[PDB]
Structures are given as structure tokens and as C-alpha cells.
Amino acid sequence: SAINVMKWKTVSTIFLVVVLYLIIGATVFKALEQPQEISQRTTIVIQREKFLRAHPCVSDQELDELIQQIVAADPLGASSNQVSHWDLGSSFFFAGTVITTIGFGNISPRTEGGKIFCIIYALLGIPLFGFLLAGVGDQLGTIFGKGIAQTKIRIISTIIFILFGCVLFVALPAVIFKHIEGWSALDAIYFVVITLTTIGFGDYVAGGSDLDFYKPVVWFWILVGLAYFAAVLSMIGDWLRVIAKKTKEAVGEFRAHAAE
């Protein structure tokens, strides 16, 4: 049971590194988001007061319960007639979000039957889509293997892999998203990263804004791009332990010599 002691040491150290990494990212995001927050938090109260004052004739407090009744929309007399969010197409993009575990959450089920089905549908879809993604990844890895046909040559081959990768699966689809969805250059690249890393905040969605040839390419862009980041995230993880183990040899060697 000595190897179990050796495992628990490594596990606890990784968890201490993860916490540090989380603390670092925490401080950086809040040092990047708190400023625009407080500006918006004060300029929304300016608009509250300047439209309570212009119209004190509401039962003034209901503005806040009104806003609550509007955060439930999370309509107007103009275009009181819309299209669905669970139409013949969006439900098949939402079934895709469930099995891919990207879960943008822009439209989530509200029926108890829908919630229970979504649970069973995920528990069966996540493994099934895993076999699909594995088959697609093996297929594309052999397409790359055919096209690439000692250690220095294989580093060059990994470089040209990552290059065509960001070209086909990052550059081109982001430009397509920038064109049709009307996003910026960063918003497109941000959307590509958040989608194919299976994070999917839902702040940007390709099928959210209201050609029907658009989407069949989207979910099958998503399918193959997931195989791509799967390889890329695996290479990044491999890079992390190589750096991690050689920083461990350097610290042990640093300490040991102690400037002679």
C-alpha cells in the first residue's frame, strides 16, 4: 500500500495547484469585470430614478416587481406574433446540446416531463455521443496520418497539425459566425472556444438570434471541432506534465545546490 501513499501525495498537490490556479483566475476576472459592473450598476439606477421621476404615477414600487416580472422573460405590441424556441429545428439543436454536454442553456425545459426526459436523454446520449466523437476523432486522426506521411520531424508535424486545426475549425467558422450572426472578431473566436471546449456559457449562441442551411453545418461543425479540441486539450495536458515534472527536477536541484 506504499503506492497508494505515493498517489495521495500527488493528488493532494494537484488539488493545491488547482486551488492556486482558481484563486489566480478569480482575482483576474474580478479585476476585469468589477469596473464595468459598478458602472452599469450605477447607470441602471440612474435610469430607474429618471423614469420613476418621469412617471411617479405607477405604484412606484411595482417597477421593481415589474422588472422581476420581466426577468421572467429571461413581446411588444409591435410583433405580438413570434416564432417558437421549441420548433421543429431548435429542439434538435437542444437535443444536441444535451448529448454534447455543451448546454448553452439559452432555452431550457420547463415541463416536469421535459426535465425528466432530459435527464434520461442525457444519461443515454452522453455515452452514445462519446462513441460518435471517438469514431470521428479516429477518422480525422487517420486522415491527418495519411497526409503527414526523427523527434524533430514529429514536432514539426504537430505544428502543422495545430495550424490547419485553427484554420479549419477556428478561423473559418468564426469568420462565418462573424458574417451571418453579426459578431465581432473576438466574439466569434470567443464563441468557438467556449463551444468546442464543451463549456457553453450561452452568452453567445449560433442558433439563438432570430438560412436553415446554417445550422446543419453548425452542429456538424460542432461535432468535428469537438474531435479537434479533444486532441488539442490532450496535447496541452501532455505539455503540462512535462513542464510540471521538469519544474520538479529544477526545484529539487535548486534546493540541493543552494548556490554551492
By CB under 6 A, is residue 184 in contact with ligand HEX? no
* Backbone angles phi and psi of 258, in degrees to 5: 55, 50
Q: How far is the CB of 244 from a second copy (least distance, A)?
A: 9
Residue 151 interacting with a second copy (CB under 8 A): no
The torsion angle over the Cα atoms of residues 242, 247, 252 and 253, rounded to 10 degrees, is: 100
Select from 51-59, 201-209, 216-224, 248-256 the region that touches K ion (CB under 5 A).
201-209
Number of residues that bind a second copy (CB under 8 A): 124
- CA 163 vs CA 37, 160, 193, 200: distances in Å: 37, 5, 16, 24
Helices 214-257 and 90-100 meet at what angle, rounded to 10?
20
Q: Which amino acid is at 98?
A: V
Whole-angstrom Cα distance, residue 222 to residue 205?
Answer: 12
Ranges within 94-153 binding ligand HEX (CB under 6 A): 112-113, 116-117
- Cell numbers linked to 142: 487517420
Residue 210: which of 180, 186, 185 has the closest Cα? Answer: 180
The verdict on 137 binding K ion (CB under 5 A) reads no
The residues in 167-226 that bind a second copy, with binding defined as CB under 8 A, are 186-187, 189-190, 193-194, 197-203
Q: Please choose which of ligand CCCCCCCC, a second copy, ligand HEX, none residue 248 contacts, taking the beta carbon within 5 to 8 angstroms, the exact cut-off set by kind.
A: ligand CCCCCCCC
Q: Decide if 21 contacts 29 (C-beta within 8 A).
A: no
Binding flags for K ion, 16-55, as an x/- string (CB under 5 A)? ----------------------------------------
Give the Å distances, CA to CA, from 235 to 16, 54, 193. 23, 59, 16
User: Could you tell which of ligand HEX, ligand CCCCCCCC, K ion, none binds residue 208, using a CB distance below 5 to 8 A set by kind?
Assistant: none
Q: For residue 208, state whether it binds K ion (rule: CB under 5 A).
A: no
Q: Which span sits near a second copy by CB under 8 A: 105-113, 150-158, 161-169, 174-182?
A: 105-113
Q: Does 202 bind K ion (CB under 5 A)?
A: yes
Query: Distance from CA of residue 33 to its chain's centroid?
Result: 18
Report the interface residues with ligand HEX, using CB under 6 A: 112-113, 116-117
